[PDB]
Amino acid sequence: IPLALPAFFPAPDNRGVEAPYRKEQRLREVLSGLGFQEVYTYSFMDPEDARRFRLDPPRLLLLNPLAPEKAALRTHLFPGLVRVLKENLDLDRPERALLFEVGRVFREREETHLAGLLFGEGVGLPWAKERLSGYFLLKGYLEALFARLGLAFRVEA
Amino acid sequence: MRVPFSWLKAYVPELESPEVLEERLAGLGFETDRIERVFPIPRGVVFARVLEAHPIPGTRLKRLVLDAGRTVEVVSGAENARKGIGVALALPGTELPGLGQKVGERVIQGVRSFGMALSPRELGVGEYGGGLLEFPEDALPPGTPLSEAWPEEVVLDLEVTPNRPDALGLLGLARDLHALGYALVEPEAALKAEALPLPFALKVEDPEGAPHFTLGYAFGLRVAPSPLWMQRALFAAGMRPINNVVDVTNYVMLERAQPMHAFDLRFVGEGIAVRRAREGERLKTLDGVERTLHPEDLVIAGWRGEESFPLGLAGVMGGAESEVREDTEAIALEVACFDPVSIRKTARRHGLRTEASHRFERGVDPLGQVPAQRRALSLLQALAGARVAEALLEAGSPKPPEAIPFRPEYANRLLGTSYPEAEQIAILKRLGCRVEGEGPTYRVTPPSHRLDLRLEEDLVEEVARIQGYETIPLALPAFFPAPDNRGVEAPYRKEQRLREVLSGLGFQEVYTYSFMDPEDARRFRLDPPRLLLLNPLAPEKAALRTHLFPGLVRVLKENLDLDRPERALLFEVGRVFREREETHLAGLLFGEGVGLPWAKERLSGYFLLKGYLEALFARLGLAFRVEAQAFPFLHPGVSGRVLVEGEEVGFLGALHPEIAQELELPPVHLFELRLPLPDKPLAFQDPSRHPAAFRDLAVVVPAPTPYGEVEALVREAAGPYLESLALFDLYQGPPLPEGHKSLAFHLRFRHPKRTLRDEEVEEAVSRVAEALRARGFGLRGLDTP
Amino acid sequence: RVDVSLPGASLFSGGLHPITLMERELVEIFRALGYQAVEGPEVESEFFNFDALNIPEHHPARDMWDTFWLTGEGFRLEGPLGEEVEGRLLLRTHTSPMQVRYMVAHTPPFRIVVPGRVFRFEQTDATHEAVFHQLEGLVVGEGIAMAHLKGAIYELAQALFGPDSKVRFQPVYFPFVEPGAQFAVWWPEGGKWLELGGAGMVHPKVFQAVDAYRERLGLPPAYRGVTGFAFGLGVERLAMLRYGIPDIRYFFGGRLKFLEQFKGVL
Amino acid sequence: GYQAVEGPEVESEFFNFDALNIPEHHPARDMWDTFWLTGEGFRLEGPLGEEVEGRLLLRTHTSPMQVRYMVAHTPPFRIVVPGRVFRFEQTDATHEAVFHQLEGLVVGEGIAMAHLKGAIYELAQALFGPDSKVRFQPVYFPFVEPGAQFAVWWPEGGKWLELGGAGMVHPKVFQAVDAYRERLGLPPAYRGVTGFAFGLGVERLAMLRYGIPDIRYFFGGRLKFLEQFKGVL
């Protein structure tokens, strides 16, 4: 069988059909530029976790899980973020983190979510004392994100 | 090029309308910038005869007795106003475009002017307002509206591209239209010639300049105004009628892209000599300006005895003295091909651009002079009653064009089209080529007049446009690209990520001109610029950017003075010029800094920059540090060279206050460095499952010691088992050696396979106590859990 | 003075996940051949994951896909046209359903590449995951032939491995493709044949399935007189060879010391 | 399938003009009001990094890049080359003395004008949607025959955009590069191939897209202006 490449004008309904995918990749990329570290988490969730992190129950369950801790479907990205901070405080005792995950989550419909996570001392001069951290550090990084996406941003009570 | 619909319509009768002509010429390769409708002439303007012209005693005015159906008088101040010509008479009541007020009978210096005779400007047909419009005395019956012999015209404004000089003649255009399938009407040039000697010779002393040069002889001329139809045509093409013979020379020219000039024999002497001008030789040209010729200038000269005198500035503008006027009875007719470069030079050398030059710059049909002589001679015969000799004087033997190999199959192949051979070969003929042979490859020679037809692919464009660029199908190519082309885009891509990671980081990008102000080298204290403009936009833009940052600084100023922003973090990537062209990336900080706009604490200035930067390189995966090295344009206190992956690439620092002074701004912080950035390849380091070993101890060190040297030293001896080495407290004061300083260092260790025993730790850290104390340092702290 | 080597305001440096890099290079590679990238849902129906791909019930071909079955009430699983779809729910065992999906919603000719998270009930070791990523290809239209499939893969290989690279095609069985095939690439600095993925000419019964679904949705047939080629290519495997990662389990792990190692890459 | 490469902003007359069939004192050079540079000790490196000589100038178009590229590579290939380009012209609202061009060059066996049209058709479809169409008219460039200007139809404007020029790369260009190749000791590579190039001005297009009323803004430094584009993607 010879080698060859096809030539054709694609049909109209196929035009810019990649907009969505591309949109999400920029998000990720602008995010790396911003200062966020990305992490992949299993799509599974521990049913007990709904109580723990105080979530409404998970609607999709495994008729045959890898194990009970992996017996339902992720309703939120963040629990996994938290659980993964624990996991490498217990390992490499890092002093601070700025994580972000994008994953599919499951409830009513399948939807795409983006979750972020801060922690620790914050940012400044590691030899000095003043630091920016906690809530407004987050909100600061975020209103900056949206500055770049060109979207209006505020948070209420 | 003004292209008057009705005039073109004479050669191509079947034209549908000005607009389908616009679209027709479009497919031919000629864009029309505007389509204008031109000669609105009201009822009130009638043709009239000047029976007598009577000076008004005491004035510079004349009483004109006109036959305008009935007899009427008007007063005119016009030089040319005089008996025996026809005029355009605007009667009382007439609304003229170029005067806004109405036309009445008013009283002037004793006489009731019953309207007025018009100038080209007053009627609305030309810019000229220095004289009466002058017509043949019999052009019309007295009193008839001009409209009836002077209909409105529409004239398209065509751009004609340099490859189509033949298109600088309307008959040129017609030929193209003809190839689309429109019928052509070439003007028949009826000559009743006479066999007899030309009363003057020809001596062309410069075949370089005039590879082909002809003279025609016309005598017994009745110089007078041109007929209405010619005046109308000429005015429409942006030229103003002068008379008979002059007008015919302009009319041909506009027709077949072939400038020509009638010299009055009175001034010609024994002969015309087409030659270079003698230094300083003078010449009053047509436009009435006294000029001084250059040796490189080719002149049309005459001679008499041992006298040689310039008659005109060849191919550009005729002399003023020999211009044809009412009393001229005979002329030598110049019709030639001139050296395009020479004419070009002459023209620029003198600040002249004419219909005559221009056509000679773009180029004229190397074998058209004779056909041209005939057309002109013919007209001169028809309109001025010229008698004309059979013989021309001719000098130059230009060769016909050579045949070009042409393959309908290549044509279809090169285009993607599928035109039948027969159709290709026919179009080629309509455009006037000879096509010999039977195929597959044809002998096809173009008409001399198509300067632009030399190559086989020239011929293909020829069938393409005549056939229609629209008749070319759409398609996409498929091919495996050649190997040397693989990943050839790496560099470009590399630079785009840089930019993009930069936007994500928080940097704002800005484009700056590549120019630099030569004075700026002093200002910002740079070595001079090596590339200079032999012709700048202006002195401030007269050299080439040696650094990106000056422009950054200058642009901060520029919008502090405008929008008073409180802070900025700019970045530019541009090409810079010195020794070689290189790609640079410059950044810029300024202002309060970052924190909580309602609180007080802020991070800013130098370490804010360095912070953003070591973060950048964190993301590019490159090692980053800066050392101590002055830079003429920086602070002697805030000056560093940048070291990515261990090699110097530019500078980090705070502007020099003395420059901040001169340019009138607060402390700015900038950096500049050479692209491309060093690449570091992944050396994936499988981590360690087994736990780490923590302990802290500070280092007491002299004040001037750069953080680098210590960190470096602590590291290099710390061992083949170190992890997080980082600084967590800078203290200075009591109880340290009269102004020293201790550095708080967080240390961590670890081992891939086994686990770290307290033995291998306390040892290897005292092995750091080795080169540390044995250098002049020592510990403020030690072994703190 | 102002010690100029003294560490600066330590700001946060972000990074991308190994898979994201690999996914990216992948789509970048294919989008230069004119493939456009679209995604599909991770929770699928058996109809899309199996039946529409010629993988029928109690057929010995389903054993290539150890499947997670999901239960749960009140869950709108939206189809190609956003219509509420019914069917026994599961987790994607491959991205392949996306091409039935896409074909219903669009018309030929087109080139698509679809990345996704995919699931299998399997024992998590060092060269195996229960959750990993695939990259699908689908090129459908008049005239499309197996020479074009080979061409694509040849192109893939040239770009991931340089000129010294070559591709190998061997017959193999997939229900949604015949002629079917496994493809391997030759990677010079390894002197090794990489089994990369499977492929073939999209199966007549697949085209039939989509045009049938189309009718139910009231749409016109669009795949009677076209041919196509698809491929399925597993991404972790490829990322492992590229970034030199010894253990697939790392990808889903959260170890910063691991993730951070990839900030550089481009 | 176009790959993007760049070229130098400071060029030789040989690359900017002679190799593109734009000869000295030819009336076709008037389409390019040129900045001439002077300066001593300046290595202007050629396609193979060799030190090149010749009268220095600023790129009047990106076009030289394709002579450049063709010397350094072999057919078939698709390239697109962006760049900053210069012209001695009066800075108004729809004109710059410094602006950007995007070149295209597709060379190989079999390449034809149908493929040029195809490319542009594709360009237009993507910048303007399906309701868009392209118009091709003959026009003159010395480095291309058949040559052509192309315009695109932009629906929300009901307007024909004159976008750029194009054509089948000229026989004398291929000849020029293969000649330069010999001087460099390389083998001929363009005897039996055809090609199509295009030149497309970018500010014009950016103005229609982002709705910018004044070209002078691009080189201006106004943050209040630049900042307005943080969003876009």
JSON list of C-alpha atoms in Angstrom, two decimals, chain B residues 26-29 31 159 161-163 341 344-345 348 361-362 410 413-416 452 455 457-458 460-461 465 469-470 472-482 484-489 492 495 508-515 530-537 544-545 555 558-559 562-563 568 570 572 575 577-581, chain D residues 3-10 25-27 30-31 34-43 45 56 58-59 69 72-78 82 84 86 88-89 91 96-98 100 106 111-115 117-118 121-122 136-140 145-149 162 168 170-171 194 218-224 226-227 230:
[
{"chain": "B", "resi": 26, "resn": "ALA", "atom": "CA", "xyz": [-10.93, 45.16, -14.25]},
{"chain": "B", "resi": 27, "resn": "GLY", "atom": "CA", "xyz": [-10.58, 41.62, -15.62]},
{"chain": "B", "resi": 28, "resn": "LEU", "atom": "CA", "xyz": [-8.01, 42.89, -18.09]},
{"chain": "B", "resi": 29, "resn": "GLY", "atom": "CA", "xyz": [-5.80, 44.06, -15.27]},
{"chain": "B", "resi": 31, "resn": "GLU", "atom": "CA", "xyz": [-8.43, 49.17, -11.95]},
{"chain": "B", "resi": 159, "resn": "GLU", "atom": "CA", "xyz": [-4.36, 53.12, -13.28]},
{"chain": "B", "resi": 161, "resn": "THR", "atom": "CA", "xyz": [0.69, 49.40, -14.58]},
{"chain": "B", "resi": 162, "resn": "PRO", "atom": "CA", "xyz": [4.34, 49.76, -15.82]},
{"chain": "B", "resi": 163, "resn": "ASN", "atom": "CA", "xyz": [4.24, 46.47, -17.68]},
{"chain": "B", "resi": 341, "resn": "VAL", "atom": "CA", "xyz": [16.61, 55.58, -18.55]},
{"chain": "B", "resi": 344, "resn": "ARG", "atom": "CA", "xyz": [13.93, 59.23, -16.64]},
{"chain": "B", "resi": 345, "resn": "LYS", "atom": "CA", "xyz": [17.17, 60.86, -15.42]},
{"chain": "B", "resi": 348, "resn": "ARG", "atom": "CA", "xyz": [13.95, 63.96, -12.44]},
{"chain": "B", "resi": 361, "resn": "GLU", "atom": "CA", "xyz": [9.95, 56.20, -19.23]},
{"chain": "B", "resi": 362, "resn": "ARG", "atom": "CA", "xyz": [7.42, 53.36, -19.35]},
{"chain": "B", "resi": 410, "resn": "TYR", "atom": "CA", "xyz": [1.80, 23.99, -20.03]},
{"chain": "B", "resi": 413, "resn": "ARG", "atom": "CA", "xyz": [-1.01, 22.95, -16.40]},
{"chain": "B", "resi": 414, "resn": "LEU", "atom": "CA", "xyz": [0.36, 26.18, -14.92]},
{"chain": "B", "resi": 415, "resn": "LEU", "atom": "CA", "xyz": [-3.14, 27.53, -14.36]},
{"chain": "B", "resi": 416, "resn": "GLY", "atom": "CA", "xyz": [-5.05, 24.40, -13.34]},
{"chain": "B", "resi": 452, "resn": "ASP", "atom": "CA", "xyz": [5.62, 42.87, -21.60]},
{"chain": "B", "resi": 455, "resn": "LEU", "atom": "CA", "xyz": [8.37, 34.53, -21.88]},
{"chain": "B", "resi": 457, "resn": "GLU", "atom": "CA", "xyz": [4.47, 32.29, -18.94]},
{"chain": "B", "resi": 458, "resn": "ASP", "atom": "CA", "xyz": [3.79, 35.84, -20.09]},
{"chain": "B", "resi": 460, "resn": "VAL", "atom": "CA", "xyz": [-0.18, 32.15, -20.25]},
{"chain": "B", "resi": 461, "resn": "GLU", "atom": "CA", "xyz": [-1.28, 35.22, -18.19]},
{"chain": "B", "resi": 465, "resn": "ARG", "atom": "CA", "xyz": [-6.99, 37.22, -18.18]},
{"chain": "B", "resi": 469, "resn": "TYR", "atom": "CA", "xyz": [-9.32, 34.69, -13.72]},
{"chain": "B", "resi": 470, "resn": "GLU", "atom": "CA", "xyz": [-12.82, 33.60, -12.63]},
{"chain": "B", "resi": 472, "resn": "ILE", "atom": "CA", "xyz": [-9.77, 29.28, -12.90]},
{"chain": "B", "resi": 473, "resn": "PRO", "atom": "CA", "xyz": [-11.05, 26.48, -10.61]},
{"chain": "B", "resi": 474, "resn": "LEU", "atom": "CA", "xyz": [-10.33, 26.23, -6.89]},
{"chain": "B", "resi": 475, "resn": "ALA", "atom": "CA", "xyz": [-8.11, 23.49, -5.50]},
{"chain": "B", "resi": 476, "resn": "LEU", "atom": "CA", "xyz": [-5.83, 22.39, -2.75]},
{"chain": "B", "resi": 477, "resn": "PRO", "atom": "CA", "xyz": [-2.42, 20.73, -3.13]},
{"chain": "B", "resi": 478, "resn": "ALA", "atom": "CA", "xyz": [-1.33, 17.47, -1.50]},
{"chain": "B", "resi": 479, "resn": "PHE", "atom": "CA", "xyz": [2.35, 16.55, -1.04]},
{"chain": "B", "resi": 480, "resn": "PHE", "atom": "CA", "xyz": [4.83, 15.06, 1.37]},
{"chain": "B", "resi": 481, "resn": "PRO", "atom": "CA", "xyz": [7.12, 18.05, 2.10]},
{"chain": "B", "resi": 482, "resn": "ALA", "atom": "CA", "xyz": [10.83, 17.58, 1.54]},
{"chain": "B", "resi": 484, "resn": "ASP", "atom": "CA", "xyz": [15.03, 19.71, 4.87]},
{"chain": "B", "resi": 485, "resn": "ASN", "atom": "CA", "xyz": [11.77, 21.57, 5.54]},
{"chain": "B", "resi": 486, "resn": "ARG", "atom": "CA", "xyz": [10.96, 19.60, 8.77]},
{"chain": "B", "resi": 487, "resn": "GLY", "atom": "CA", "xyz": [10.50, 21.51, 12.01]},
{"chain": "B", "resi": 488, "resn": "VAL", "atom": "CA", "xyz": [11.75, 24.52, 10.13]},
{"chain": "B", "resi": 489, "resn": "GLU", "atom": "CA", "xyz": [9.34, 26.57, 12.24]},
{"chain": "B", "resi": 492, "resn": "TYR", "atom": "CA", "xyz": [9.33, 31.17, 15.21]},
{"chain": "B", "resi": 495, "resn": "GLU", "atom": "CA", "xyz": [9.53, 33.17, 20.19]},
{"chain": "B", "resi": 508, "resn": "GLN", "atom": "CA", "xyz": [2.21, 44.16, 28.69]},
{"chain": "B", "resi": 509, "resn": "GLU", "atom": "CA", "xyz": [3.69, 44.18, 25.22]},
{"chain": "B", "resi": 510, "resn": "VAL", "atom": "CA", "xyz": [4.39, 47.21, 23.11]},
{"chain": "B", "resi": 511, "resn": "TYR", "atom": "CA", "xyz": [5.70, 47.84, 19.59]},
{"chain": "B", "resi": 512, "resn": "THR", "atom": "CA", "xyz": [8.31, 50.57, 19.13]},
{"chain": "B", "resi": 513, "resn": "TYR", "atom": "CA", "xyz": [9.69, 51.96, 15.86]},
{"chain": "B", "resi": 514, "resn": "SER", "atom": "CA", "xyz": [13.00, 50.40, 14.79]},
{"chain": "B", "resi": 515, "resn": "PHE", "atom": "CA", "xyz": [14.44, 53.87, 14.33]},
{"chain": "B", "resi": 530, "resn": "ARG", "atom": "CA", "xyz": [26.22, 51.66, 13.36]},
{"chain": "B", "resi": 531, "resn": "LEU", "atom": "CA", "xyz": [23.40, 51.84, 10.82]},
{"chain": "B", "resi": 532, "resn": "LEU", "atom": "CA", "xyz": [22.30, 55.30, 9.64]},
{"chain": "B", "resi": 533, "resn": "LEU", "atom": "CA", "xyz": [19.61, 56.54, 7.30]},
{"chain": "B", "resi": 534, "resn": "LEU", "atom": "CA", "xyz": [20.78, 57.99, 4.02]},
{"chain": "B", "resi": 535, "resn": "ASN", "atom": "CA", "xyz": [17.27, 59.48, 4.06]},
{"chain": "B", "resi": 536, "resn": "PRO", "atom": "CA", "xyz": [15.39, 59.46, 7.41]},
{"chain": "B", "resi": 537, "resn": "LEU", "atom": "CA", "xyz": [11.77, 60.45, 8.03]},
{"chain": "B", "resi": 544, "resn": "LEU", "atom": "CA", "xyz": [18.75, 52.12, 13.76]},
{"chain": "B", "resi": 545, "resn": "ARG", "atom": "CA", "xyz": [17.73, 50.96, 17.24]},
{"chain": "B", "resi": 555, "resn": "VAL", "atom": "CA", "xyz": [7.19, 55.38, 25.87]},
{"chain": "B", "resi": 558, "resn": "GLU", "atom": "CA", "xyz": [4.83, 59.46, 26.68]},
{"chain": "B", "resi": 559, "resn": "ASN", "atom": "CA", "xyz": [1.82, 58.11, 28.61]},
{"chain": "B", "resi": 562, "resn": "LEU", "atom": "CA", "xyz": [-1.16, 61.53, 28.87]},
{"chain": "B", "resi": 563, "resn": "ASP", "atom": "CA", "xyz": [-3.01, 59.11, 31.13]},
{"chain": "B", "resi": 568, "resn": "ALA", "atom": "CA", "xyz": [3.36, 49.65, 34.42]},
{"chain": "B", "resi": 570, "resn": "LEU", "atom": "CA", "xyz": [5.85, 46.48, 29.82]},
{"chain": "B", "resi": 572, "resn": "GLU", "atom": "CA", "xyz": [8.93, 44.50, 23.96]},
{"chain": "B", "resi": 575, "resn": "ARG", "atom": "CA", "xyz": [15.05, 43.31, 16.15]},
{"chain": "B", "resi": 577, "resn": "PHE", "atom": "CA", "xyz": [20.99, 46.55, 15.02]},
{"chain": "B", "resi": 578, "resn": "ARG", "atom": "CA", "xyz": [24.71, 46.32, 15.82]},
{"chain": "B", "resi": 579, "resn": "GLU", "atom": "CA", "xyz": [27.41, 44.15, 14.21]},
{"chain": "B", "resi": 580, "resn": "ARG", "atom": "CA", "xyz": [24.65, 41.74, 13.28]},
{"chain": "B", "resi": 581, "resn": "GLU", "atom": "CA", "xyz": [20.86, 41.98, 13.40]},
{"chain": "D", "resi": 3, "resn": "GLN", "atom": "CA", "xyz": [5.15, 26.51, 8.30]},
{"chain": "D", "resi": 4, "resn": "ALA", "atom": "CA", "xyz": [6.29, 29.95, 9.50]},
{"chain": "D", "resi": 5, "resn": "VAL", "atom": "CA", "xyz": [9.89, 31.24, 9.18]},
{"chain": "D", "resi": 6, "resn": "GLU", "atom": "CA", "xyz": [11.30, 34.76, 9.48]},
{"chain": "D", "resi": 7, "resn": "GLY", "atom": "CA", "xyz": [13.91, 36.90, 7.74]},
{"chain": "D", "resi": 8, "resn": "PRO", "atom": "CA", "xyz": [16.14, 39.88, 8.60]},
{"chain": "D", "resi": 9, "resn": "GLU", "atom": "CA", "xyz": [14.73, 43.44, 8.64]},
{"chain": "D", "resi": 10, "resn": "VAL", "atom": "CA", "xyz": [18.02, 44.85, 7.28]},
{"chain": "D", "resi": 25, "resn": "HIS", "atom": "CA", "xyz": [16.55, 52.17, -12.59]},
{"chain": "D", "resi": 26, "resn": "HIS", "atom": "CA", "xyz": [13.48, 50.12, -13.47]},
{"chain": "D", "resi": 27, "resn": "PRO", "atom": "CA", "xyz": [10.09, 51.88, -13.25]},
{"chain": "D", "resi": 30, "resn": "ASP", "atom": "CA", "xyz": [8.68, 53.03, -7.61]},
{"chain": "D", "resi": 31, "resn": "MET", "atom": "CA", "xyz": [6.16, 50.72, -5.96]},
{"chain": "D", "resi": 34, "resn": "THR", "atom": "CA", "xyz": [13.00, 52.71, 0.03]},
{"chain": "D", "resi": 35, "resn": "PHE", "atom": "CA", "xyz": [15.14, 53.55, 3.06]},
{"chain": "D", "resi": 36, "resn": "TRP", "atom": "CA", "xyz": [18.83, 53.24, 2.20]},
{"chain": "D", "resi": 37, "resn": "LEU", "atom": "CA", "xyz": [21.18, 52.46, 5.08]},
{"chain": "D", "resi": 38, "resn": "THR", "atom": "CA", "xyz": [24.84, 53.25, 5.55]},
{"chain": "D", "resi": 39, "resn": "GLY", "atom": "CA", "xyz": [27.27, 51.97, 8.16]},
{"chain": "D", "resi": 40, "resn": "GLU", "atom": "CA", "xyz": [30.61, 50.29, 8.53]},
{"chain": "D", "resi": 41, "resn": "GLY", "atom": "CA", "xyz": [31.42, 46.92, 10.07]},
{"chain": "D", "resi": 42, "resn": "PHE", "atom": "CA", "xyz": [28.06, 45.16, 9.88]},
{"chain": "D", "resi": 43, "resn": "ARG", "atom": "CA", "xyz": [27.87, 41.46, 9.04]},
{"chain": "D", "resi": 45, "resn": "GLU", "atom": "CA", "xyz": [24.34, 37.15, 7.05]},
{"chain": "D", "resi": 56, "resn": "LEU", "atom": "CA", "xyz": [22.12, 47.75, 2.49]},
{"chain": "D", "resi": 58, "resn": "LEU", "atom": "CA", "xyz": [15.35, 48.11, 4.99]},
{"chain": "D", "resi": 59, "resn": "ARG", "atom": "CA", "xyz": [12.95, 45.40, 3.75]},
{"chain": "D", "resi": 69, "resn": "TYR", "atom": "CA", "xyz": [14.29, 30.23, 1.97]},
{"chain": "D", "resi": 72, "resn": "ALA", "atom": "CA", "xyz": [18.37, 27.00, 2.01]},
{"chain": "D", "resi": 73, "resn": "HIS", "atom": "CA", "xyz": [15.78, 24.29, 1.39]},
{"chain": "D", "resi": 74, "resn": "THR", "atom": "CA", "xyz": [14.33, 22.09, -1.34]},
{"chain": "D", "resi": 75, "resn": "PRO", "atom": "CA", "xyz": [10.80, 21.61, -2.82]},
{"chain": "D", "resi": 76, "resn": "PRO", "atom": "CA", "xyz": [8.06, 20.78, -2.08]},
{"chain": "D", "resi": 77, "resn": "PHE", "atom": "CA", "xyz": [7.26, 23.03, 0.88]},
{"chain": "D", "resi": 78, "resn": "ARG", "atom": "CA", "xyz": [4.65, 25.46, 2.20]},
{"chain": "D", "resi": 82, "resn": "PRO", "atom": "CA", "xyz": [5.56, 37.44, 8.81]},
{"chain": "D", "resi": 84, "resn": "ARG", "atom": "CA", "xyz": [8.26, 44.09, 9.97]},
{"chain": "D", "resi": 86, "resn": "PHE", "atom": "CA", "xyz": [9.62, 49.61, 5.88]},
{"chain": "D", "resi": 88, "resn": "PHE", "atom": "CA", "xyz": [9.59, 56.01, 3.09]},
{"chain": "D", "resi": 89, "resn": "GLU", "atom": "CA", "xyz": [6.01, 57.32, 3.27]},
{"chain": "D", "resi": 91, "resn": "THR", "atom": "CA", "xyz": [2.41, 58.71, 8.31]},
{"chain": "D", "resi": 96, "resn": "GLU", "atom": "CA", "xyz": [2.42, 53.78, 7.81]},
{"chain": "D", "resi": 97, "resn": "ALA", "atom": "CA", "xyz": [6.12, 54.05, 7.05]},
{"chain": "D", "resi": 98, "resn": "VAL", "atom": "CA", "xyz": [6.50, 50.93, 9.12]},
{"chain": "D", "resi": 100, "resn": "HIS", "atom": "CA", "xyz": [3.75, 44.26, 8.75]},
{"chain": "D", "resi": 106, "resn": "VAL", "atom": "CA", "xyz": [4.12, 27.13, -2.01]},
{"chain": "D", "resi": 111, "resn": "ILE", "atom": "CA", "xyz": [1.59, 23.40, -8.12]},
{"chain": "D", "resi": 112, "resn": "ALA", "atom": "CA", "xyz": [-0.82, 25.61, -10.07]},
{"chain": "D", "resi": 113, "resn": "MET", "atom": "CA", "xyz": [-2.81, 28.84, -9.87]},
{"chain": "D", "resi": 114, "resn": "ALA", "atom": "CA", "xyz": [-5.87, 26.87, -8.84]},
{"chain": "D", "resi": 115, "resn": "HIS", "atom": "CA", "xyz": [-3.95, 26.20, -5.63]},
{"chain": "D", "resi": 117, "resn": "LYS", "atom": "CA", "xyz": [-6.97, 30.64, -5.44]},
{"chain": "D", "resi": 118, "resn": "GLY", "atom": "CA", "xyz": [-7.71, 27.68, -3.19]},
{"chain": "D", "resi": 121, "resn": "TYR", "atom": "CA", "xyz": [-10.49, 30.96, -0.66]},
{"chain": "D", "resi": 122, "resn": "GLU", "atom": "CA", "xyz": [-9.50, 29.09, 2.44]},
{"chain": "D", "resi": 136, "resn": "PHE", "atom": "CA", "xyz": [-8.97, 37.77, -8.24]},
{"chain": "D", "resi": 137, "resn": "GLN", "atom": "CA", "xyz": [-7.92, 40.40, -10.82]},
{"chain": "D", "resi": 138, "resn": "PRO", "atom": "CA", "xyz": [-4.82, 40.52, -12.97]},
{"chain": "D", "resi": 139, "resn": "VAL", "atom": "CA", "xyz": [-2.13, 42.90, -11.72]},
{"chain": "D", "resi": 140, "resn": "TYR", "atom": "CA", "xyz": [1.63, 43.38, -12.14]},
{"chain": "D", "resi": 145, "resn": "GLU", "atom": "CA", "xyz": [3.44, 36.04, -13.69]},
{"chain": "D", "resi": 146, "resn": "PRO", "atom": "CA", "xyz": [0.56, 35.39, -14.03]},
{"chain": "D", "resi": 147, "resn": "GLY", "atom": "CA", "xyz": [0.22, 38.04, -11.33]},
{"chain": "D", "resi": 148, "resn": "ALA", "atom": "CA", "xyz": [-2.82, 39.20, -9.47]},
{"chain": "D", "resi": 149, "resn": "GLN", "atom": "CA", "xyz": [-4.46, 41.27, -6.78]},
{"chain": "D", "resi": 162, "resn": "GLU", "atom": "CA", "xyz": [-8.24, 44.55, -1.26]},
{"chain": "D", "resi": 168, "resn": "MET", "atom": "CA", "xyz": [2.85, 32.09, -9.84]},
{"chain": "D", "resi": 170, "resn": "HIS", "atom": "CA", "xyz": [8.38, 34.10, -11.80]},
{"chain": "D", "resi": 171, "resn": "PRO", "atom": "CA", "xyz": [10.73, 31.95, -13.91]},
{"chain": "D", "resi": 194, "resn": "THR", "atom": "CA", "xyz": [6.22, 25.62, -10.18]},
{"chain": "D", "resi": 218, "resn": "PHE", "atom": "CA", "xyz": [0.01, 50.35, 16.53]},
{"chain": "D", "resi": 219, "resn": "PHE", "atom": "CA", "xyz": [3.31, 52.17, 16.95]},
{"chain": "D", "resi": 220, "resn": "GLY", "atom": "CA", "xyz": [2.28, 54.54, 19.73]},
{"chain": "D", "resi": 221, "resn": "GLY", "atom": "CA", "xyz": [2.79, 52.93, 23.11]},
{"chain": "D", "resi": 222, "resn": "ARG", "atom": "CA", "xyz": [-0.55, 54.10, 24.47]},
{"chain": "D", "resi": 223, "resn": "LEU", "atom": "CA", "xyz": [-1.38, 51.60, 27.23]},
{"chain": "D", "resi": 224, "resn": "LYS", "atom": "CA", "xyz": [-4.98, 52.77, 27.17]},
{"chain": "D", "resi": 226, "resn": "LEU", "atom": "CA", "xyz": [-2.79, 48.28, 24.03]},
{"chain": "D", "resi": 227, "resn": "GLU", "atom": "CA", "xyz": [-4.65, 47.21, 27.20]},
{"chain": "D", "resi": 230, "resn": "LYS", "atom": "CA", "xyz": [-5.91, 41.72, 26.77]}
]
